[PDB]
Amino acid sequence: TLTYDTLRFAEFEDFPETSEPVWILGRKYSIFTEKDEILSDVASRLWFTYRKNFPAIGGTGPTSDTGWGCMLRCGQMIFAQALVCRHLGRDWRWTQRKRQPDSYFSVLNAFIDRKDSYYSIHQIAQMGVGEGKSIGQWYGPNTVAQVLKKLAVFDTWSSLAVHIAMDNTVVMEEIRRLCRTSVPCSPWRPLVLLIPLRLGLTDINEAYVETLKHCFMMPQSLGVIGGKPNSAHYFIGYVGEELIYLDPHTTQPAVEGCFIPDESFHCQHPPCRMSIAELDPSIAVGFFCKTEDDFNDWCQQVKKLSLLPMFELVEQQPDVLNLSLDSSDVERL
């Protein structure tokens, strides 16, 4: 039950001192003159790993998700980043020896391993059953995304709108129908947009690489979740031909007013890097648009990227994930 803690014995390497820009969730950095800021941004992200000794799920279920909940943990991380942007702002940073806002602890609390937290492993796992997934079963990006949408309905504090765009299409009228609370003279529910995709049979077609990089360069970028079963990762950026990510494969003891010892929820080891060409095909890309202007800006950026494609943007109108098979893929398949 501790052969799944792969992060414990992984190879860690410091960031290469090169001229290649370092992108972390819509923010561009230079490793030469902004190394501290880069490390601060990565460490600031809410990190969620396997946990142990938390209340049994459903009273008789697991007390640890080691070996099965890594995609659930990545789902928690990408959704937490959205809540951080929604309640704290993209410019917020976590620092030891500093008093964090009360909202920070409220966000963190929503991911604590107890059934009364909105996005706890308990609620995610239990909600997954309704999706046809038994507790203890590993999920794919699409499934965890569908679960988060249903869980967010109860979170009236955040009052988020979660849209999962299938068929590789983002219908703008659907987004407005989901987010508009009233006729514009908050009138807009902060939007968490998740787009499940499959960029290849065994690997991602190289033609998608450039599009994928651009997904981390938008002010609304929440990153990407994906990976093979029990090898899920939360990708938060890239540098050169590598993706930067947070890994949940380490089991930590569950953490028991406002204050919460939060050291274990911040990744302080050298940020994990992986070759883009080694990324599993099944992923879910996310974007956060707090206001309608943010959404409009996002659409404008998707227009360019498309013109100068993983998904299409249309104004109006089975849920399918389209796999673009090249001549070779058609043969190997």
From Swiss-Prot:
PTM-bearing positions, type S-nitrosocysteine = C185, C258, C267
Q: What is its EC number?
A: 3.4.22.-
Source taxon at top rank: Eukaryota
Q: Specify the effect of C258S.
A: Does not affect S-nitrosylation. Strongly decreased S-nitrosylation, leading to increased hydrolase activity and autophagic flux. Reduced formation of intrachain and interchain disulfide bonds in response to oxidation
Q: Name one GO molecular function term.
A: cysteine-type peptidase activity
Q: What is the effect of changing R198A?
A: Strongly reduced protease activity
Q: What is the effect of changing S231A?
A: Decreased phosphorylation by AKT2
- InterPro entries to which the protein is assigned, alphabetical: ATG4_LIR, Papain-like_cys_pep_sf, Peptidase_C54, Peptidase_C54_cat
What reaction does this catalyse?
Answer: [protein]-C-terminal L-amino acid-glycyl-phosphatidylethanolamide + H2O = [protein]-C-terminal L-amino acid-glycine + a 1,2-diacyl-sn-glycero-3-phosphoethanolamine; [protein]-C-terminal L-amino acid-glycyl-phosphatidylserine + H2O = [protein]-C-terminal L-amino acid-glycine + a 1,2-diacyl-sn-glycero-3-phospho-L-serine
**What is stated as this protein's family in its record?**
Belongs to the peptidase C54 family.
Q: What does this protein do?
A: Cysteine protease that plays a key role in autophagy by mediating both proteolytic activation and delipidation of ATG8 family proteins. Required for canonical autophagy (macroautophagy), non-canonical autophagy as well as for mitophagy. The protease activity is required for proteolytic activation of ATG8 family proteins: cleaves the C-terminal amino acid of ATG8 proteins MAP1LC3A, MAP1LC3B, MAP1LC3C, GABARAPL1, GABARAPL2 and GABARAP, to reveal a C-terminal glycine.
Q: What is this protein called?
A: Cysteine protease ATG4B
